[PDB]
Amino acid sequence: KYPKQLFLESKNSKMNSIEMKYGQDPAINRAEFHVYGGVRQSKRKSEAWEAAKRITKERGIPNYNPDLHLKGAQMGQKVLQTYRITGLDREWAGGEDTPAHKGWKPGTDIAGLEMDDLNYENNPAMQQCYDDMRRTAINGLSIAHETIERRFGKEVTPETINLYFEMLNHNIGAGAIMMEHTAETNPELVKDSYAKCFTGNDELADALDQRFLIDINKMFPKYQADQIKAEVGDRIFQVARIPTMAVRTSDGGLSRAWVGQQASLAFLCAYDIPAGDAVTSDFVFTIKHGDVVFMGTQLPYRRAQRNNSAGGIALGYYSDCNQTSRTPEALEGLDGGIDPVKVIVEALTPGCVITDQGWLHNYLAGGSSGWSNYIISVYTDEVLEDYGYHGAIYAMDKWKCGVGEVPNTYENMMTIAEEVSRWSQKNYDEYPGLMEAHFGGSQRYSIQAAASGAAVGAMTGDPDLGNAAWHYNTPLCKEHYLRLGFYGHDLQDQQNMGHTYSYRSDQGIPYELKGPNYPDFAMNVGHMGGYIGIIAGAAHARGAAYSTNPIIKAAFADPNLQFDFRYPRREFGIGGLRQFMPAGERDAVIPPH
């Protein structure tokens, strides 16, 4: 009772993602090797070799040289495959121009990308996704307004708030207000930096200058707006984004400090407070410490970080910054019903790329590869997509219910995991071209685990139980193939078969609040983004507007963001096409180049 696999036939464009890699039926266990010209089969690597020759001549030191590959064998003795972004043919919304690119035509595929196009090092959409997270500072303003009204003695009104925000938008990136003879920043360098606010009080929202407003009523469907507004209440939260260029000179911990300076100044200047009045220190303290929401928490000494590093971001904060939950595709994509699978598979895309390439690679390890093929596998060619939907189809038929409604018993988790594992293995076993595409055991193992957890999370609404299904895939995978992933893959899988429902000191913690500093997760690729997706989808499936923090969810519902948090697979593909214009470049102040 199962449909044709999505990796052989995309739902609308009917592309065969696996066949396209080879021009041969992927069911056939036969291939010729050593006949591709090595790297000459790759446009990017061939172009890179030519560029490298020019670079060597200019700088006097050799660089990229494919002929160094070991023992006379250039890379490319097998097909160096291209990739198709999963699911783009099933989108119908999100066609607006963004700060990074003109409007995408929803439904348009991105196929034929090379591996190097989806390397974090080469892909500005991926870098900008992280930069947008870490340059964000979020604060309640209630205490600052209280200090002004009682200590200083001046009334706060919508008019004074509007002036405050106009001044903060002048000074957050570019300008000065109070002082003579003060240096300023070139506006071209900081055009991505701005500040807005949101509130659950609709009368206040309507009284504010809409240019400074994240409009919850406009951004979210009514049931989600209702839930978010109920949590925000009659309060005002500020969302400020410091310059991308600035975090690229330093760290995300700059954000709360920077906004502390500039918001304090905007208060002084909008309310005419004397320079050096004692109230000033309440503003910076409020912004840095007193009423503050961070994307990430600090990390301990071995991996020391201030706030707003990727390693400090809780899984559920990665879940909730993603905005797929408010898209038409997520709200009506299952024949008019909500589609938590779409939420899962989108949210896991920045989840995986940022935690594994942005953080584990570009902070904790590194090098020229970005570990890119490992992670490309989770958002391309409809493979994980097919397996995840398979579990949902199976479960909806078996339990005769909708998403989020299968009883969240351990037995039901194990049944769904057994079927999704089975289906994953059936396809890798029956399609030699797919087994060769996902040539690393880690890709295949993470994919069956992720699909299982996606199905359980979407079908039960329970994020811990969905992630329990991930770890149960360990024996199901190992006892079938007699191989798993790379040498160090199954640290967390083995131990979380036990830790998921432990309460020992550093073992127990809800999945929403786990993150890259949970010790089991602190080292290895191929996992955290899956959990992130599962958390997001579990909440979506049970009728919630967010999983972990309504302030985070609202704070990223903002069309002025450089990265489109609603459609991350698409965005990464656009970066793969070299069509994503990031923020933070220094063109305004450097020579013609």
């Binding site: 040498y487 083995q494 000191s505």
Partner: protein
């Protein structure tokens, strides 16, 4: 409630040390020798007088090849230091000085003791070692317990050394930063006394992975050096440090307390001679012979029984005592490393034994391995991070606070200590390289070097209280 079940404590020669000991009496919350071990780590430091003297003399302060240069031959450099060469160059000496610290070690030790001591007969000790090159220092409990931190021996010793040297040699104002640097290194630009000459067995107090991890941030190489490679004493020291650490982490409580206490007793203290017996039975064989010995011993002692026989004849076993089963797997795990890494006399395979002893146990029995996932998980992480480009190192640099190896609840680091003890010199980051001074100086403390008999004797002294 008290852990009243009786165990026998055996030495590493397989002979009983003390019989009829309630499990309660070996726990860190009760046993005086275990508690004194923590206290000695907290209160002892070493002062490297030879190192301080050398730094001051040559200008090679701190670490990282730092050198503050004094130039005694300025007129031979081919430079003019005056416009037109009006005045010939004259050398100065402004960053270095020669103090006879090693030759004066006995008097220095007396002055140091007087500064550290709070009251006569309070237990403050300073011992001259290495013919004056090193002082061993143990501060009094009175001083150490004044506040809340474990760093008081380190901080008071560094300041006392700096003050007493400034006074003894009546040094001028210029010397203050330099003598400070000789003892403190780069402190306070660094939180650590980085490149200094006051050394603790404990890491800097900024470095924990979580609250309660200080007794876990001790490399296996330090443990092996301090026990001079006597395998089961290294195991006992590591296991006991881990046991203290797990109390401080809050994990030796409530429905987990017995489980945690049994890991220590069975893996760390050769309870009921299990570790010795398993090695004796299987020592001429392979890891798998230890698997057979472990399951056999668990059956013999009634810890497990056949639960179900499947149609193929394969038998699932049930744990009649789950916490004791876990502890027997932990004992088998250290025995397996001893047999496997002992046969090779090479530590590197310890990570593989950690993984596959546990994996074989599960396939053999249908029961969960040590730590319900952590034994295999750390087998995986430790194997990876001792054989790959990404991080880590050789076995001896890991600890209970290292991100790679922290997860297991007390039963992983002791097997590293066993493997490194058995290694014939196959490493380049062995105990001699990372921990030579630690082994030479702190290894003279009998309780650190030879904890098994001390713990057993202390348990026998309190056994009638439970």
């Amino acid at each position: 409630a008290y852990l009243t079940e009786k165990i026998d404590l055996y030495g590493d020669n397989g002979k009983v040390l003390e019989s009829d000991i309630p499990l309660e009496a070996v726990t860190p919350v009760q046993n005086p020798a275990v508690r004194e071990l923590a206290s000695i780590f907290k209160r002892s430091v070493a002062v490297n007088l030879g190192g301080a003297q050398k730094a001051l003399s040559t200008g090679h302060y701190a670490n990282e090849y730092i050198h503050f240069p004094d130039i005694p031959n300025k007129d031979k450099l081919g430079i003019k230091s005056s416009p037109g060469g009006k005045y010939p160059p004259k050398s100065v000496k402004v960053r270095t000085m020669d103090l006879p610290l090693v030759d004066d070690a006995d008097d220095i030790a007396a002055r140091l003791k007087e500064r550290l001591q709070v009251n006569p007969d309070d237990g403050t000790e300073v011992r001259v070692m290495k013919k004056g090159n090193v002082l061993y220092v143990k501060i009094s409990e009175q001083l150490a317990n004044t506040g809340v931190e474990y760093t008081t021996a380190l901080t008071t010793t560094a300041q006392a050394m700096t003050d007493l040297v400034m006074e003894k040699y009546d040094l001028d104002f210029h010397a203050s930063p330099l003598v400070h640097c000789a003892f403190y290194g780069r402190y306070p630009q660094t939180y650590e006394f980085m490149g200094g000459n006051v050394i603790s067995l404990l890491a800097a107090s900024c470095a924990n992975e979580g609250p309660g991890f200080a007794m876990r941030n001790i490399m296996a190489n330090h443990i092996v050096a301090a026990t001079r490679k006597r395998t089961l004493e290294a195991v006992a020291l590591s296991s006991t440090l881990e046991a203290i650490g797990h109390v401080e982490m809050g994990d030796a409580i409530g429905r987990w307390r017995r489980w945690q206490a049994l890991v220590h007793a069975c893996q760390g203290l050769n309870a009921n001679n299990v570790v010795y017996d398993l090695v004796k039975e299987a020592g001429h064989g392979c890891t798998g012979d230890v698997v057979a010995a472990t399951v056999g011993r668990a059956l013999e002692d009634g810890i497990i029984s056949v639960k179900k026989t499947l149609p193929s004849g394969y038998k699932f076993y049930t744990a009649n005592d789950p916490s004791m089963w876990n502890a027997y797997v932990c004992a088998g795990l250290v025995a397996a490393v001893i047999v496997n890494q002992g046969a090779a006399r090479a530590a590197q395979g310890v990570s593989s034994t950690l993984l596959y002893f546990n994996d074989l146990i599960e396939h053999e029995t249908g029961l969960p391995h040590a730590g319900y996932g952590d034994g295999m998980g750390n087998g995986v992480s430790f194997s990876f991070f001792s054989h790959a480009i990404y991080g880590g190192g050789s076995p001896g640099i890991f600890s209970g606070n290292h991100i790679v190896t922290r997860h297991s609840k007390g039963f992983a680091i002791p097997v590293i200590a066993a493997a490194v003890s058995l290694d014939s010199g196959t490493a380049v980051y062995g105990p001699e390289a990372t921990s030579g001074l630690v082994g030479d100086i702190f290894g003279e403390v009998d309780l650190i070097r030879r904890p098994m008999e001390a713990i057993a004797s202390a348990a026998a002294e309190i056994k009638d209280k439970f």
